[PDB]
Structure 1
Amino acid sequence: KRHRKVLRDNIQGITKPAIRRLARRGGVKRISGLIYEETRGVLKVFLENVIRDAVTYTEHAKRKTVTAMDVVYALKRQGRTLYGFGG
């Protein structure tokens, strides 16, 4: 059927101070402006590519709920394997 919620544009929810903290951990001392919407470009392509794969896993398993474990079979498939969520 259908219910409350249809989409939105949370892309701008990546506060500048959020991307800045990633880069501060990534050893970065100085950050251009053009940076923060550049990162919004990549981070968006990342998840699209993981979640495509994770959604492909859920659809095989004929669920409607994406698990932690669906994300992991994809993340590994995309050579970025994660320890701390089973598998």
Structure 2
Amino acid sequence: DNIQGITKPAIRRLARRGGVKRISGLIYEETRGVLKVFLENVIRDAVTYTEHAKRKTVTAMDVVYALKRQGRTLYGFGG
């Protein structure tokens, strides 16, 4: 597990907001795939931001600063 922790009827909650009509079977995974890859990409850059600051913990900024350089900005935790 740890990837499957992302519950099926829940993914549909997110699918909901997007105005997802019905849904599918093979989707849930295809999705589990994206989400994962999205993550790595951020976390990596972040984890790298964390490590530049001789830390062990990953701050809020640590992420922000990643999400920025990655194109997907995020207002709200910059404080």
TM range (shorter): over 0.9
Q: Of the two, which has the highest radius of gyration?
A: 1
Aligned counterparts of 1:55 and 1:35: Cα–Cα separation in 2: 29
User: Which ranges of structure 2 fall in alignment gaps of 5 or more residues?
Assistant: none
Aligned counterparts of 1:17 and 1:77: Cα–Cα separation in 2: 33
Runs of 4+ in 1 over 3 A off after TM superposition: none
> TM-score of the superposition, structure 1-length normalised?
0.87
What does the per-residue CA deviation read over 1:27-84, in whole Å, with 9 as the maximum and x for residues that have no partner? 0121010010110001000110000000010011110000000000000000000011
Aligned counterparts of 2:74 and 2:37: Cα–Cα separation in 1: 19
Aligned residues: 79
Of structures 1 and 2, the one scoring higher in RCO (CA 8 A, sep 6+) is 2
Measured on the aligned residues, the alpha-carbon RMSD in Å equals 0.9
User: Which ranges of structure 1 fall in alignment gaps of 5 or more residues?
Assistant: 1-8
Q: Percent identity?
A: 100
Are 1:52 and 2:44 an aligned pair? yes
